[PDB]
């Protein structure tokens, strides 16, 4: 199960107009006694900038991730199909590449969030 | 060790000018008696389109991946730092997401290629 606590836990809302970049924030809280590594993935990678898109969260700490929806012609009739995934693993004791490739599938935790466009 | 055979095996060369998209091809041959899954990764994801960026290669078969360098202001004095990784796994018996998340790091094979810009 996911160790991190996400606010919002499951739907990311974005408020228009969308003639400019619209940011929504994702709070990642680590309530646990261990460092936790995270990486953000999306079903629509061209459509968003995510900053940071990965990192490490110290025990007890919180990191707020900025999710930047790129501008587009908004169809108030089309409901978003976009999703995000926050993948996590407890931090091992140099390199973050090496960390993800070494990770056993049993170690990995995911949260998924659905995006929602409101006007 | 990498099961697929790559032509080219290690450097991908891109010929200018670069005021338009420039493609180079990567041949992925499966000499083995088993299906093989592949995914392509890059150090410079905004700079390239890769088609297909993943797939499955039947035993005996060959797939040619198109690597499309996006247009840019070329500095003949800057040498490219870009790299690609072709990650592979033998094919298991519905869904490719499920396939990558279930992969044990011991199962995974990578090839790395260096990009090279020539005029």
């Amino acid at each position: 199960e996911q160790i991190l606590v996400l606010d919002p836990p499951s739907d990311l809302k974005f408020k228009g107009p969308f003639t400019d970049v619209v940011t929504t924030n994702l709070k990642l809280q680590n309530p646990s006694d261990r460092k936790v590594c995270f990486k953000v993935k999306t079903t629509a990678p061209r459509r968003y900038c995510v900053r940071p898109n990965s990192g490490v969260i110290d025990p007890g700490s919180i990191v707020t991730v900025s999710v930047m929806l790129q501008p587009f012609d908004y169809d108030p009739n089309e409901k978003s199909k976009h999703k995000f995934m926050v993948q996590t693993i407890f931090a091992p004791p140099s390199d973050m590449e090496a960390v993800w490739k070494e990770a056993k599938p049993d170690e990995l935790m995911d949260s998924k969030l659905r995006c929602v466009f409101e006007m | 060790e990498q099961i697929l055979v790559l032509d080219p095996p290690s450097d991908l060369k891109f010929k200018g000018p670069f005021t338009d998209v420039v493609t180079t091809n990567l041949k992925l041959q499966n000499p083995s008696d088993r299906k093989v899954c592949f995914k392509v990764k890059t150090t410079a994801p905004r700079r390239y389109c890769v088609r297909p960026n993943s797939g499955v290669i039947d035993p005996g078969s060959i797939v040619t991946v198109s690597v499309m360098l996006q247009p840019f202001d070329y500095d003949p004095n800057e040498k490219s730092k870009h790299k690609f990784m072709v990650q592979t796994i033998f094919a298991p018996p519905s869904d490719m997401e499920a396939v990558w998340k279930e992969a044990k790091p011991d199962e995974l094979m990578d090839s790395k290629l260096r990009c090279v810009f020539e005029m």
Binding site: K39, K41, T42, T43, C49, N53 | -
Partner: peptide, 9 residues
């Protein structure tokens, strides 16, 4: 169904 890619920054 849904294919997840690494988010860009």
């Amino acid at each position: 169904e849904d294919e997840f890619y690494d988010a860009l920054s």
